[PDB]
Write an enzyme that holds these catalytic residues in place. Structure first.
Site, PDB file in Angstrom:
ATOM      1  NE  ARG A  67      -6.227  16.416   6.706  1.00 57.56           N
ATOM      2  CZ  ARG A  67      -5.686  15.398   6.049  1.00 57.56           C
ATOM      3  NH1 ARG A  67      -4.459  14.982   6.310  1.00 57.56           N
ATOM      4  NH2 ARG A  67      -6.396  14.782   5.108  1.00 57.56           N
TER       5      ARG A  67
HETATM    6  N1  ADP Z   1     -11.616  11.369  17.406  1.00 59.34           N
HETATM    7  C1  ADP Z   1     -11.047  11.506  16.187  1.00 59.34           C
HETATM    8  N2  ADP Z   1     -10.285  10.531  15.656  1.00 59.34           N
HETATM    9  C2  ADP Z   1      -9.717  10.661  14.444  1.00 59.34           C
HETATM   10  N3  ADP Z   1      -9.849  11.748  13.667  1.00 59.34           N
HETATM   11  C3  ADP Z   1     -10.586  12.801  14.077  1.00 59.34           C
HETATM   12  C4  ADP Z   1     -11.239  12.735  15.392  1.00 59.34           C
HETATM   13  N4  ADP Z   1     -11.899  13.892  15.556  1.00 59.34           N
HETATM   14  C5  ADP Z   1     -11.686  14.637  14.443  1.00 59.34           C
HETATM   15  N5  ADP Z   1     -10.901  13.990  13.562  1.00 59.34           N
HETATM   16  C6  ADP Z   1     -10.476  14.521  12.242  1.00 59.34           C
HETATM   17  O1  ADP Z   1     -10.006  13.481  11.385  1.00 59.34           O
HETATM   18  C7  ADP Z   1      -8.920  13.972  10.599  1.00 59.34           C
HETATM   19  C8  ADP Z   1      -7.938  12.851  10.299  1.00 59.34           C
HETATM   20  O2  ADP Z   1      -6.662  13.414  10.026  1.00 59.34           O
HETATM   21  P1  ADP Z   1      -5.426  12.477   9.614  1.00 59.34           P
HETATM   22  O3  ADP Z   1      -5.315  11.346  10.601  1.00 59.34           O
HETATM   23  O4  ADP Z   1      -4.236  13.369   9.375  1.00 59.34           O
HETATM   24  O5  ADP Z   1      -5.898  11.869   8.203  1.00 59.34           O
HETATM   25  P2  ADP Z   1      -5.157  10.595   7.563  1.00 59.34           P
HETATM   26  O6  ADP Z   1      -5.857   9.422   8.198  1.00 59.34           O
HETATM   27  O7  ADP Z   1      -5.397  10.733   6.083  1.00 59.34           O
HETATM   28  O8  ADP Z   1      -3.718  10.749   7.984  1.00 59.34           O
HETATM   29  C9  ADP Z   1      -8.282  15.086  11.408  1.00 59.34           C
HETATM   30  O9  ADP Z   1      -7.976  16.197  10.565  1.00 59.34           O
HETATM   31  C10 ADP Z   1      -9.323  15.491  12.426  1.00 59.34           C
HETATM   32  O10 ADP Z   1      -9.766  16.821  12.156  1.00 59.34           O
END
Ligand code: ADP
Ligand code: ATP
Ligand code: MG
Ligand code: MG
Lengths: 470, 495, 48, 187, 95, 57
Positions: free
Chosen positions: B363
C-alpha cells in the site's frame, strides 16, 4: 469534594476507597501527583466504600495509597463554533500545538436518546455520482449508511471519495471521528484538507472539526472517543438549526475495545468470547444518531468484518440500525473491478416504485435478474465446453459480461494507483446507458470498450481509437 | 597478575526497603512487604536474580522472575531499585551479541555505554510525521519490481514452515554493504535482528554466515532462545525496538526484524495464566491485539523539524496448514501496510523464491521507486496479469504468443541464495526480457543466458551502468546502445 | 431441510480445478471474437 | 451505614474483618484495654478439652452450642460486647478461627503504641555490654516511637559480620562481600 | 467461603447492641450492570415488584439465604450503595 | 595464526586457575579466631557506620 486512596492496580483496572463520600456511577476522577493528566471513570460499587474504575491512559508508576480527587460530574469537553479546524483529544485537549481552545460552553458526553414523539418521516434521494450506488441502492438525506467489508477491499478510499464529492458542495458543517486506526492516515487527511482550503490556518472560515483516538492507546480510551465525536455534532444539530455531516472510521473498534476488560471486571463470557452486554451497549450509543424535528444528521459509518464472515456477532447485530448498506467483496476485487461492490447483496429502503419512479425501478430489477441468471450457466460450462451452448445462452452471457464491466469507474483520489483522471456521472445517463445495453444496441462492440469509463458516450470513442490503433 | 589486583583494588552500604516471600512456584513469587513500590518496577532478589512487579493487591505483590527459580525459597528478602525497567542504548552495541537485558554473551567483554532508555514508550503522534518518499532496496528481483518497499513502512512476511522466510531477511541484511561502504551518510542503513524461541545452534550458524560476508560491523543481534524464561521472550522485542529508536531521533535510518512473532504470544499466555487471570479464546489473554498494536506503531518517518530519521519493521508469522483465517494471523494482517505470501506448491514446482504475485500487495503505490525501474516493471505487470487469466487449462494469433511470453517471463524471476543484485543490473536483465529479445530460445536454457550475459556486461561495459545509476532514468542514447549490445551478444552467445 | 443444500454458482466458489478450468475457456472464447469485431469496425468506418 | 474508625495495621481476611469490626466497636465507648484483657481471659477459658470437644463436634446442633456459650459468658464474670461477639461467631459457625481473631486484635493493639520490631543477626554471640551499646544506638535511630523489640539471633552460617532489620529498613554488612570479590572474574 | 453479608458494617451493628424493620424494607450492598444485591426483605415473594428510593422499579428473581438479587428497570446511575428498598406486595399486571 | 591462538588459550587457563586458587585460599585462611578478632573490630566499625547512617535522617 471527596478524597480517596488507590488500593489495587491490575492491568488497566484500578480500585479506589473513599472515606467521606461515595461518587455516583459515570463520574470523573483525577489522580494527584503526576506530571501529565490522568483521569479515571467509575464503573461499579463493590460495597464497603470501594469502587472499580477504568483508566484513560497508561497506569505505570502508580503507587498504592496515592491520593485521588473527585470532580463531581461526568467528562466535560469544550463545544461551540471555536472548535472548527482544530484537533482535540478523547477528553478535549488540543493536540495540534496552536494554543488552548477558548469557548464559553461545555457538555457532558453521557446523555439520553430522543423519545418516540420526536421522530421524523421524510425520504429524499441524495445523488453522489457513482453508478452502482445511484442505480441499485440510493442514499437518502438524513439517513444512516454502512460500508461493510473485509481487510484490504477499499473502505477508506470510498469514504474519502464520499467526502470529496458530498462535503465540499454542502452548506453546513462536518465532523470526522477516527476510532482505532492508523496514525499515518490521520497525518495524510490533515494535510489533504489544508490544500483544498476546507481548513484554514489564517482566516476563520473553516468547515470541519476533527477528533482522534488511534490503535496505540489503551482499551479505556478507544471505547469512548465515539461519544466525544457525536457530542460535538449534537450541538450543531440542536443549538443551531443546521444540517450536519458525520463520518466515522471503523466503528467496529468500539466493540472490540469493550471485550478486553470484561474478564477483569468479573464477568462470564458469552459466545465466541464476547461480553454478555453487546447488544445493549451498541443500542445505547446508536440511538443518539438521529434526525429529530429540530435538525438533521447524515451519517456514514465504516464497519470491519473479521475474516470475511458476515455471520460474526459483531456485524450481525449491526444490520438492524441502518437504512442503506453496501457490501464489498474480495472475489470481485480479484477480477480487477473497482469499487468492489457486490451487486446482489446491497439494499436500500427507498427502492420503491412510488419514490424513484417506474423506469428507474424496472432498469435495476432487469439488471439484477440477468446477473442472477448468469451464475446458473457457469455450472454447465464447467462440464461441457463453451461452444456446445445454444445461441441464446451465448447472447445472454455476452450481454451479462458487458453489463458487469460498465459498473466500474475511475475515482479522483486514486489517480496514483490507476493513473487516470476521475469522472462523475449524473443520474439520467446512468439510467440510459444500462437501458440501451439491455435493449441490445451495442452487440457489435468488444468488451474492453466498457472498462473504466464514465458515461456511455466514451465507450464508442474508446472503441474507435482501439480500431484505429489495430 | 596486576590486572586482577587492580580489578579488586577498586564498598558502601545503605538502608533499603524490603519485603518477605510468602510462596514460590513455577516462576511466580508472592511477596509480603513492600509498600511504596511502583507498578512495572524492577526489584532484586538476594542471590542476584531480578524481577518485575505486575499485580499490586491489598495483601501481596506478584513478581515474575528473570531467570531460574531453583534458588528462591520461602522467607527470603527482596529489595527495590527505584527505577522502571530500561536497557542500555547507543552505537557501541554494533558488532555485539547481547541477551534480552543488554548483557554480552559473545565473550568479548563489557559494553561501554553512557545512556539508558525505557522499554515502554509512546509512539509519535500526528504532527511530527511526514509522508514516505525514499526507497528501501533488498536485492530480490521479484520484490523490487512488483512489491516495492519504502523507508518508514511495515511489511509482513507470512507462510507455512520450511518455505523460505528467514533467507529473505538474511539476503536483505547483506545487500546493504554497497551503501555503508561509501561516502554520503544520507544513504546508509543500520540493521537489528531479534530471535525469539529458536535454538542456539541456528543462531550460531546465522552469525557465522553473517561474519563471513563482512556484515557484522553494522548489525546488532538480540537473542532469547528456547531455554530462557518466558518473561525474557516476552520482553525481547521491545528491548530491541528501544535500541532502534536511538537512531531514529538523531537523523539516521535503521531496520528491525522480529523473527516468529507467533512465539511471543505463547510466552505471554503462559505468563498470564500463572498469575490467575481468566483465559479467553484458545486461552489467550483478553488483549493480545494490544500486545502487537503498541509495538508496530513505533515505526515512523520524521519531518525536518525533528531530524529526518526513520525506522522500518518486518515482522514474521507462521500458519498451520496454510490457514490464513486463524485467530492470531488476522490480528496482525489488519495492522501492517502489506504482506508477502509464500506457498509450498510453488516451492515444489521450481519457483524459488515462492512468492505469490497474485496476492502480495504493497500500500505505497510506488511513490518511492526509481524512475528507470517503473518503465520496465509497469509493462511486466500487464504481461503477467494477462498470462494468469488464460494459461491454466487443466489461437496462434493471441493465445500461443501470450503463454510463449509468459513462460519466458516466469523463468526470469527465479534467483539463487546469498547473492543480491544491484538495481541497474536488474534493470538491464528485465529490459532484455520485456522487449522480446528472448522469444526464440527454448525456455530451458534461459538461466545460463542470464548468468553469462550478466558476467559479460559487468566486465566489458562498466561505463554504461554508471550512466543509468547517475541519471536515474533511461535515455535515447542509452536505449540505442542497449539494443546493439543485446543483439550482438545474443548472436555470439549460441553455444 | 436438515441436510446440506447447494445453490447456484457453487462450482466457481470453491476454487478447485474445475473453477479455473471453467474460467480459462471463457477467457479464450471471448478473446477470439474481439478481433473480428474490430476488423469489421475498421472496414465499416473506412467504407463510409 | 455509619463510618467506622480504621485500625492502623489493617490486616485482611475473615479474622481481619471480625477484628476490624471489634476494634471499631471498642474505639467507641473507649474500652480497648478492658476488651483486650477480656479476650485474653476468653482465650484462657476455651482451652479446656471438654468445651473443646463440645466445640469441635460437627454432629451437635448449633442451638445447643449457642446456649452453652451464652451460659458460660453470662456466668464467668464480664458482660461487655464480647458476649455479642461470641454469640455472633457461634451463630455464623466461625468458632474455629477464634485464636486467629484474638491474635489479630492483639497485634492490632500492639501497633496502637507500636514498638517497631527489630532484629539483629550475628555469627557469634556478642557481649552484653556491646548489646546495650547497640540498644543505645538503635534507640537513636528509632527516634519517634516506642521501645524497640530486639530479637538476638546467632547464625554461624555467615563467616562474620552483622545484619540489622528495623521495620522495612534493611542493612546487610556480612561476608556477602565474597560475591562482590568474585565478580572481578566477570569484570 | 465468605458470605455476601459477612462485611464489617453489618457485623458492627450487631456488636453494638441495637429500630430498623428488616421485614418490609432493605438496604443495598452493591450495584453494577443492572444487578443489585439487597439485605433484608424477609417477607418478599418470588417474582415481585419493589420500589427504590429514587423512583425506579425492580423485580425479585433470586432468594438467597442472606440476600436477594434484583433487576433494575432503568439506568444504574440513579442507584448507589446504602439506599432504601421497600415492598409493594403485588406481581406485574397490565391494563 | 596457529601459534598466536595456542598462546592465548594458555593465558586464559592460567588466569582462571589463579582466580580459583585465590578465592579458595581466602575461604580457607578465614579462621574462627580471625573471625572473633575481626568481628570485634567490625563491631566497633559497624557501630560507627550505623552512627554515620543514623546521623542522616
Ligand atoms: N480504484 C480503487 N478503489 C479502491 N481501492 C483501490 C483502487 N485501486 C486500487 N486500490 C487498492 O485497494 C486497497 C484498499 O486499501 P484500503 O482502503 O486502505 O483498505 P481498507 O478498505 O481495508 O481500509 C489500496 O491499497 C489500493 O492499493
Ligand atoms: N531461493 C532459494 N533457493 C534454494 N533454496 C532455498 C531458497 N530459499 C530458501 N531455500 C531453502 O529452503 C529451506 C528453508 O528455508 P528457511 O530456513 O528460510 O525456512 P523458514 O521459513 O525460515 O523455516 P522454519 O519454519 O523452519 O524456520 C532451506 O533449506 C533453504 O536452503
Ligand atoms: Mg482502512
Ligand atoms: Mg526461519
Amino acid at each position: 469534594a471527596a478524597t480517596g486512596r488507590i488500593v489495587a492496580v491490575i492491568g488497566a483496572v484500578v480500585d479506589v476507597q473513599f472515606d467521606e463520600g461515595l461518587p455516583p456511577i459515570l463520574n470523573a476522577l483525577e489522580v494527584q501527583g503526576r506530571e501529565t493528566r490522568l483521569v479515571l471513570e467509575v464503573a461499579q460499587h463493590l460495597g464497603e466504600s470501594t469502587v472499580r474504575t477504568i483508566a484513560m491512559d497508561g497506569t505505570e508508576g502508580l503507587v498504592r495509597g496515592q491520593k485521588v480527587l473527585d470532580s463531581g460530574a461526568p467528562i466535560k469537553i469544550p463545544v461551540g463554533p471555536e472548535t472548527l479546524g482544530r484537533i482535540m483529544n478523547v477528553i478535549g485537549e488540543p493536540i495540534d500545538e496552536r494554543g488552548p481552545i477558548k469557548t464559553k460552553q461545555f457538555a457532558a458526553i453521557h446523555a439520553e436518546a430522543p423519545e418516540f414523539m420526536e421522530m421524523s418521516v421524510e425520504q429524499e434521494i441524495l445523488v453522489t455520482g457513482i453508478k452502482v450506488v445511484d442505480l441499485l441502492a440510493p442514499y437518502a438525506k438524513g439517513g444512516k449508511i454502512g460500508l461493510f467489508g473485509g481487510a484490504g477491499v477499499g473502505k477508506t478510499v470510498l469514504i474519502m471519495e464520499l467526502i470529496n464529492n458530498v462535503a465540499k458542495a454542502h452548506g453546513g458543517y462536518s465532523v470526522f471521528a477516527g476510532v482505532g486506526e492508523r496514525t499515518r492516515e490521520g497525518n495524510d487527511l490533515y494535510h489533504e484538507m489544508i490544500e483544498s482550503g476546507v481548513i484554514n490556518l489564517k482566516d476563520a472560515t473553516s468547515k470541519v472539526a476533527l477528533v482522534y483516538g488511534q490503535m496505540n492507546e489503551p482499551p479505556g480510551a478507544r471505547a469512548r472517543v465515539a461519544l466525544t465525536g457525536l457530542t460535538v455534532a449534537e450541538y450543531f444539530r440542536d443549538q443551531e438549526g443546521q444540517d450536519v455531516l458525520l463520518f466515522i472510521d471503523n466503528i467496529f473498534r468500539f466493540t472490540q475495545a469493550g471485550s478486553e476488560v470484561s474478564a477483569l471486571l468479573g464477568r462470564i463470557p458469552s459466545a465466541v468470547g464476547y461480553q454478555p452486554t453487546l447488544a445493549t451497549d451498541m443500542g445505547t450509543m446508536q440511538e443518539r444518531i438521529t434526525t429529530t424535528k429540530k435538525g438533521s444528521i447524515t451519517s456514514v459509518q465504516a464497519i470491519y468484518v473479521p475474516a470475511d464472515d458476515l455471520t460474526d456477532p459483531a456485524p450481525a447485530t449491526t444490520f438492524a440500525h441502518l437504512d442503506a448498506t453496501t457490501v464489498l467483496s474480495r472475489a470481485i476485487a480479484e477480477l480487477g473491478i473497482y469499487p468492489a461492490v457486490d451487486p446482489l447483496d446491497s439494499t436500500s429502503r427507498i427502492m420503491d416504485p412510488n419514490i424513484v419512479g417506474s423506469e428507474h425501478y424496472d432498469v435495476a430489477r432487469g439488471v439484477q435478474k440477468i446477473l442472477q441468471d448468469y451464475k446458473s450457466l457457469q455450472d454447465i460450462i464447467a462440464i461441457l465446453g463453451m461452444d456446445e451452448l445454444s445461441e441464446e445462452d451465448k447472447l445472454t452471457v455476452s450481454r451479462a459480461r458487458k453489463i458487469q464491466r460498465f459498473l466500474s469507474q475511475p475515482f479522483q483520489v486514486a489517480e496514483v494507483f490507476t493513473g487516470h483522471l476521475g469522472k462523475l456521472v449524473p443520474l439520467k445517463e446512468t439510467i440510459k446507458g444500462f437501458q440501451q445495453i439491455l435493449a441490445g444496441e451495442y452487440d457489435h462492440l468488444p468488451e474492453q470498450a466498457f472498462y473504466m469509463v464514465g458515461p456511455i458516450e466514451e465507450a464508442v470513442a474508446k472503441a474507435d481509437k482501439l480500431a484505429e490503433e489495430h | 597478575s596486576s590486572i586482577l589486583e587492580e580489578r579488586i583494588l577498586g564498598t558502601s552500604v545503605d538502608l533499603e526497603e524490603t519485603g518477605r516471600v510468602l510462596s514460590i512456584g513455577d516462576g511466580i513469587a508472592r511477596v509480603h512487604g513492600l509498600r511504596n513500590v511502583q507498578a512495572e518496577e524492577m526489584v532484586e532478589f538476594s542471590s542476584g536474580l531480578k524481577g518485575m512487579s505486575l499485580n499490586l493487591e491489598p495483601d501481596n505483590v506478584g513478581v515474575v522472575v528473570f531467570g531460574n527459580d531453583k534458588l528462591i525459597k520461602e522467607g527470603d528478602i527482596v529489595k527495590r531499585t527505584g527505577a522502571i525497567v530500561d536497557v542500555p542504548v547507543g552505537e557501541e552495541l554494533l558488532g555485539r551479541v547481547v541477551d534480552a537485558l543488554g548483557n554480552a554473551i559473545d565473550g568479548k567483554g563489557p559494553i561501554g555505554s553512557k545512556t539508558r532508555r525505557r522499554v515502554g514508550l509512546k509512539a509519535p503522534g500526528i504532527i511530527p510525521r511526514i509522508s514516505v518518499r525514499e526507497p528501501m532496496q533488498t536485492g530480490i528481483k521479484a520484490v523490487d519490481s512488483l512489491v516495492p518497499i519504502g523507508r518508514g513502512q511495515r511489511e509482513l512476511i507470512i507462510g507455512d514452515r520450511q518455505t523460505g522466510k528467514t533467507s529473505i531477511a538474511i539476503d536483505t541484511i547483506i545487500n546493504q554493504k554497497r551503501f555503508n561502504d561509501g561516502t554520503d551518510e544520507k544513504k546508509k542503513l543500520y540493521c537489528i535482528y531479534v530471535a525469539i524461541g529458536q535454538k542456539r545452534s541456528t543462531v550460531a550458524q546465522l552469525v557465522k554466515r553473517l561474519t563471513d560476508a563482512d556484515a557484522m560491523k553494522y548489525t546488532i543481534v538480540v537473542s532469547a532462545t528456547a531455554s530462557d524464561a518466558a518473561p525474557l521472550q516476552y520482553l525481547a522485542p521491545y528491548s530491541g525496538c528501544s535500541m532502534g529508536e536511538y537512531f531514529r531521533d538523531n537523523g539516521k535510518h535503521a531496520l528491525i526484524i522480529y523473527d516468529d512473532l507467533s512465539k511471543q504470544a505463547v510466552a505471554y499466555r503462559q505468563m498470564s495464566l500463572l498469575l490467575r487471570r481468566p483465559p479467553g479464546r484458545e486461552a489467550y489473554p483478553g488483549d493480545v491485539f494490544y500486545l502487537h498494536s503498541r509495538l508496530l506503531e513505533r515505526a515512523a518517518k520524521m519531518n525536518d523539524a525533528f531530524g529526518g530519521g526513520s525506522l522500518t519493521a518486518l515482522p514474521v508469522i507462521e500458519t498451520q496448514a496454510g490457514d490464513v483465517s486463524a485467530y492470531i494471523p488476522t490480528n496482525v494482517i489488519s495492522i501492517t501496510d502489506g504482506q508477502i505470501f509464500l506457498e509450498t506448491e510453488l516451492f515444489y514446482k521450481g519457483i524459488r523464491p515462492a512468492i505469490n504475485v497474485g496476492l502480495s500487495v504493497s500500500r505505497v503505490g510506488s511513490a518511492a521507486q526509481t524512475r528507470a525501474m517503473k518503465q520496465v516493471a509497469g509493462t511486466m505487470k500487464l504481461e503477467l496479469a494477462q498470462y494468469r487469466e488464460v494459461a491454466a487449462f487443466a489461437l496462434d494469433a493471441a493465445t500461443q504468443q501470450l503463454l510463449s511470453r509468459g513462460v519466458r517471463l516466469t523463468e526470469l524471476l527465479k534467483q539463487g541464495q546469498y547473492a543480491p543484485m544491484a538495481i541497474e543490473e536488474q534493470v538491464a536483465v528485465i529490459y532484455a526480457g520485456v522487449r522480446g529479445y528472448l522469444d526464440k530460445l527454448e525456455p530451458s536454457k534461459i538461466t545460463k543466458f542470464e548468468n553469462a550475459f550478466l558476467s559479460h556486461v559487468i566486465s566489458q561495459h562498466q561505463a554504461l551502468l554508471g550512466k543509468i545509476r547517475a541519471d536515474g532514468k533511461i535515455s535515447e542514447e542509452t536505449d540505442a546502445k542497449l539494443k546493439e549490445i543485446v543483439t550482438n551478444f545474443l548472436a555470439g552467445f549460441e553455444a | 431441510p436438515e441436510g446440506v443444500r447447494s445453490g447456484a454458482g457453487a462450482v466457481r466458489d470453491a476454487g478447485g480445478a474445475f473453477g479455473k478450468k471453467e474460467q480459462a475457456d471463457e477467457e479464450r472464447y471471448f478473446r477470439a471474437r474481439a478481433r473480428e469485431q474490430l476488423a469489421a469496425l475498421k472496414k465499416h468506418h473506412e467504407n463510409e | 451505614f455509619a463510618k467506622l474508625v480504621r485500625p492502623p495495621v489493617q490486616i485482611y481476611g475473615i479474622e481481619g474483618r471480625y477484628a476490624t469490626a471489634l476494634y471499631s466497636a471498642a474505639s467507641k465507648q473507649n474500652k480497648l484495654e478492658q476488651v483486650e484483657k477480656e479476650l485474653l481471659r476468653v482465650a484462657q477459658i476455651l482451652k479446656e478439652p471438654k468445651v473443646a470437644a463440645s466445640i469441635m463436634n460437627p454432629y451437635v446442633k448449633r442451638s445447643i452450642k449457642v446456649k452453652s456459650l451464652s451460659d458460660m459468658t453470662a456466668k464467668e464474670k464480664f458482660s461487655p460486647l464480647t458476649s455479642n461477639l461470641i454469640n455472633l461467631l457461634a451463630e455464623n459457625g466461625r468458632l474455629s478461627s477464634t485464636p486467629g481473631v484474638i491474635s489479630a486484635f492483639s497485634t492490632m493493639m500492639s501497633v496502637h503504641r507500636g514498638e517497631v520490631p527489630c532484629s539483629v543477626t550475628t555469627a557469634s554471640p556478642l557481649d552484653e555490654a556491646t548489646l546495650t551499646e547497640l540498644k543505645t544506638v538503635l534507640k537513636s535511630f528509632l527516634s519517634k516511637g516506642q521501645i524497640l523489640k530486639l530479637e538476638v539471633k546467632v547464625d554461624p552460617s555467615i563467616m562474620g559480620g552483622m545484619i540489622v532489620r528495623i521495620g522495612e529498613k534493611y542493612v546487610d554488612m556480612s561476608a556477602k562481600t565474597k560475591i562482590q570479590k568474585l565478580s572481578r572474574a566477570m569484570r | 467461603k465468605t458470605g455476601t453479608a459477612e462485611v464489617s458494617s453489618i457485623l458492627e451493628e450487631r456488636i453494638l447492641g441495637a429500630s430498623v424493620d428488616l421485614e418490609e424494607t432493605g438496604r443495598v450492598l452493591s450495584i453494577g450492570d443492572g444487578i443489585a444485591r439487597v439485605h433484608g426483605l424477609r417477607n418478599v415473594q418470588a417474582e415481585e415488584m419493589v420500589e427504590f428510593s429514587s423512583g425506579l422499579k425492580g423485580m425479585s428473581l433470586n432468594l438467597e439465604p442472606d440476600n436477594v438479587g434484583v433487576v433494575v428497570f432503568g439506568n444504574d446511575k440513579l442507584i448507589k450503595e446504602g439506599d432504601i428498598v421497600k415492598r409493594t406486595g403485588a406481581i406485574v399486571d397490565v391494563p | 595464526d596457529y601459534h598466536i591462538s595456542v598462546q592465548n588459550m594458555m593465558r586464559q587457563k592460567e588466569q582462571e586457575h589463579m582466580i580459583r586458587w585465590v578465592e579458595k585460599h581466602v575461604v580457607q585462611s578465614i579462621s574462627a579466631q580471625q573471625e572473633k578478632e575481626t568481628i570485634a573490630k567490625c563491631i566497633a566499625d559497624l557501630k560507627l557506620l550505623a552512627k554515620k547512617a543514623q546521623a542522616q535522617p
